[PDB]
Amino acid sequence: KLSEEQQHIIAILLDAHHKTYDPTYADFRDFRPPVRMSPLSMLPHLADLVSYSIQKVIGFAKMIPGFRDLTSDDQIVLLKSSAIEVIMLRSNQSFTMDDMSWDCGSQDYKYDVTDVSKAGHTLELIEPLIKFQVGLKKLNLHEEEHVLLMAICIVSPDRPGVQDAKLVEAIQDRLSNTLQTYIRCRHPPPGSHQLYAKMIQKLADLRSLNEEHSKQYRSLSFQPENSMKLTPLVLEVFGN
Amino acid sequence: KNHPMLMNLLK
Numbered sequence: 001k002l003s004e005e006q007q008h009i010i011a012i013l014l015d016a017h018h019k020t021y022d023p024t025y026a027d028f029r030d031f032r033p034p035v036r037m038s039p040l041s042m043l044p045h046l047a048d049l050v051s052y053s054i055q056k057v058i059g060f061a062k063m064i065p066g067f068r069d070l071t072s073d074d075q076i077v078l079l080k081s082s083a084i085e086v087i088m089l090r091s092n093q094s095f096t097m098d099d100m101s102w103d104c105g106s107q108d109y110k111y112d113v114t115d116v117s118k119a120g121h122t123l124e125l126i127e128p129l130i131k132f133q134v135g136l137k138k139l140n141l142h143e144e145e146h147v148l149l150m151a152i153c154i155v156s157p158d159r160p161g162v163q164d165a166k167l168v169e170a171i172q173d174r175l176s177n178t179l180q181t182y183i184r185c186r187h188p189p190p191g192s193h194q195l196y197a198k199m200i201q202k203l204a205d206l207r208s209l210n211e212e213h214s215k216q217y218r219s220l221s222f223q224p225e226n227s228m229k230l231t232p233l234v235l236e237v238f239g240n
Numbered sequence: 241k242n243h244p245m246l247m248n249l250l251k
């Protein structure tokens with residue numbers, strides 16, 4: 001029993017994702033070129049890809065019903081904390097179980113564990129990242145579920161530095177109710193069973209990955225030489 | 241708070 005509002009919410013989140021996610025990956029040609037030889041050799045390319053993906057996530061977020069009613073400061077706090085997580089989430093669409101890699105339509109734009117290693121991150125982060133991708137991919141989400149999960153991740157009350165937790169919660173709640181009802185009404189067994197609880201668990205996994213990223217990012221970024229390889233938006237969003 | 245780029249992209 002999907003309300004008219006709920007069907008509305010889904011239609012908006014699908015369009016917003018379509019407008020901010022190009023399944024052809026055409027823009028990837030504008031990044032500094034990938035290099036798979038030295039140490040940090042994929043960093044310039046992958047920082048570009050991250051920076052781009054931050055812009056696209058910001059453009060998705062702005063379309064989330066209710067998001068615009070938040071304060072500018074709270075919008076900032078939510079994006080800054082969720083950015084890496086949504087990039088992780090949104091990355092699942094290019095992630096392929098065959099190769100255990102992210103496949104962006106080209107050999108040059110196909111990323112594996114070793115490429116991520118060339119970004120300067122350890123296996124301590126990379127291993128759980130790939131495991132995350134595998135478990136998320138196995139959920140086999142409908143695109144409606146996927147777009148809802150992204151929006152729910154962005155509008156989390158439980159983010160440090162939030163001013164209006166209560167308004168953020170009421171925005172999320174309406175997305176959570178929309179998702180729950182969608183799974184029940186639009187999702188067929190067996191795919192649907194405990195699907196919500198598993199989607200909720202991925203949000204928890206993302207938080208742990210986010211913690212580990214911030215740590216390795218401080219280590220990477222702490223050196224000025226490495227920091228120079230990043231983009232101005234990546235430095236503003238992640239830190240410096 | 242020191243986020244000019246993010247703020248500009250948001251609106």
Ligand SMILES: C=C1[C@H](O)CC(=C/C=C2\CCC[C@]3(C)[C@@H]([C@H](C)[C@@H](CCCC)CCC(C)(C)O)CC[C@@H]23)C[C@H]1O
Nearest residue numbers: 046050053087088090091094102111116119121213217
């Ligand atoms: C458009 C898409 C496509 O689906 C392609 C995408 C792939 C995402 C990938 C694959 C390459 C490695 C990426 C960029 C990861 C980064 C290198 C990331 C590794 C640690 C993960 C927590 C480190 C980023 C920095 C800034 C260097 O700390 C995050 C998402 C990963 C992202 C998405 O925006």
